[PDB]
UniProtKB/Swiss-Prot annotation, chain B:
A 1,2-diacylglycero-3-phosphoethanolamine binds at R153. The keyword 4Fe-4S does not apply. This is Ubiquinone biosynthesis protein COQ9, mitochondrial. Changing W149K: Disrupts the octomeric COQ7:COQ9 complex. Membrane-associated protein that warps the membrane surface to access and bind aromatic isoprenes with high specificity, including ubiquinone (CoQ) isoprene intermediates and presents them directly to COQ7, therefore facilitating the COQ7-mediated hydroxylase step. Participates in the biosynthesis of coenzyme Q, also named ubiquinone, an essential lipid-soluble electron transporter for aerobic cellular respiration.
Amino acid sequence: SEEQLQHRILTAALEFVPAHGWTAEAIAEGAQSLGLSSAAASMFGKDGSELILHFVTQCNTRLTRVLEEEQKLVQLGQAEKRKTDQFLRDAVETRLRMLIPYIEHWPRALSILMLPHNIPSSLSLLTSMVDDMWHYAGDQSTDFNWYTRRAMLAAIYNTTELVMMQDSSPDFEDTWRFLENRVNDAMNMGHTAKQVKSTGEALVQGLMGAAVTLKNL
Amino acid sequence: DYESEEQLQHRILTAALEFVPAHGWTAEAIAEGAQSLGLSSAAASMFGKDGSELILHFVTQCNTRLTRVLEEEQKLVQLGQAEKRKTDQFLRDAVETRLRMLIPYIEHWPRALSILMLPHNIPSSLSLLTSMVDDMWHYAGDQSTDFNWYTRRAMLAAIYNTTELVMMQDSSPDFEDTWRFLENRVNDAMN
């Protein structure tokens, strides 16, 4: 189909983004690398929208397969289930490291992803990614609701992504330290006023249970 | 007539705004507001160390002021004293009206935005943003379509947040560049 051809061209174009950006230039090079004329890039706008969203989709697919591989390793008993805070730090780092070959041009990619006509796609990819991370985190520990989970992790990811753009530290250590702090901020939002009440009341029932036992002899 | 503990905090935070230009969106400004009301240094113990409460307080006042502006513009149209604007024009005017509320506080607003992006503030900041955006659409009076509730909210939130970021870097006369960016984004969305 004509969609399979577009996906092939856009995949080939990714090799050329480092030198040419998210541009028709890169798409033309991708088309030429498949034996096609540069005019094949006529199938896409000039924004770079299609190529960037293609890359984001590929990255989220790669992430899910890594997380599924990590989970199966736990199912084999060859790895221990990580705590939520550790799991989320590892999942975000794994996902953001996929940007490194393209990092010179990622600030522009982000600005294109933020164009109003791209926001439905960009936000849907982001939301599915976040939902996927939480699925494999399991958590069932914190008592955030679906909304708090999404908002906090989207913020963790989006702010860490921005910090990465300005990070000149070796292997982006400053980015992962920012990430560690933001995940710690979110994990401490689990200590709501409700949880003080529910845990305080759980202890009341615990104390009353001891009173009945003590009474009984 | 007496005051509740929420009215007291509201008073402290309103007074704290005077000290933002000199102290930023910080606990120091909050403490300064408390002393300007005659309260002890112990007053600021009721607030965190972020300055978050002050920032969220200001965002709320701005969104409240905005709803009142929109209510007034709508009443003029109901009275036949003004003609209903097209959606694209309405949203450009509403976003400009809202972002112009930042100008007296723009020196420190770049840091305030970053604090609002922290996980412990996002649920609140994101709720204020969505309610504001939903409020803008309510008064636009756009009766379909080409975008639904979800696409409408998402696009206008992006228009607002990206225009806001551009505004932080804009030293052009009367923020001409920001409104030119805004017009460009609204045209991108409607098309």
